[PDB]
Amino acid sequence: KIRLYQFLLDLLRSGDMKDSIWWVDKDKGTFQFSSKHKEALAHRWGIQKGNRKKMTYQKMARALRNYGKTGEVKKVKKKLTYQFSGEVLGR
DNA sequence: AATAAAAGGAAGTGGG
DNA sequence: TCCCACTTCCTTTTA
Ligand SMILES: N=C(N)c1ccc2nc(-c3ccc(-c4nc5ccc(C(=N)N)cc5[nH]4)[se]3)[nH]c2c1
Structure with missing residues (x-):
């Protein structure tokens, strides 16, 4: 099954x-x-x-927060804003 | 207060 | 067995 960070990246790419x-x-x-x-x-x-x-x-943001340590997605100090890793964006 | 964003510990569920 | 990759529940904190 798709991973959450990939679901989000896919949405951003498709514009859906x-x-x-x-x-x-x-x-x-x-x-x-x-x-x-x-x-x-x-x-x-x-x-x-x-x-x-x-x-x-x-609940979705609770899952997002677990990526903080491994690095796929990090919270940014801005409302409702996050950041993908270079590895995620490349791959 | 009402509303929202952010956090995280802990226990439960999937599919290996 | 025991980790994966969340999900679910509950409570706290800050704006
Ligand atoms: N409505 C809004 N416009 C709004 C906008 C921005 C906001 N930025 C926050 C927070 C930042 C930090 C928070 C926080 N630091 C915690 C430490 C520990 C715990 C815990 N449970 N131990 C919980 C914590 N929460 Se809340 N709230 C905002 C609201």
């Missing part, structure tokens, strides 16, 4: 949910969620995974 997520500086890999429209993106993640419960942005 541009009202929920967008690049801030794509060269740096920084991206930002919509305050008002992030829940619809979280719902889509849960449905893609076939999880038992409805996915929420809160």
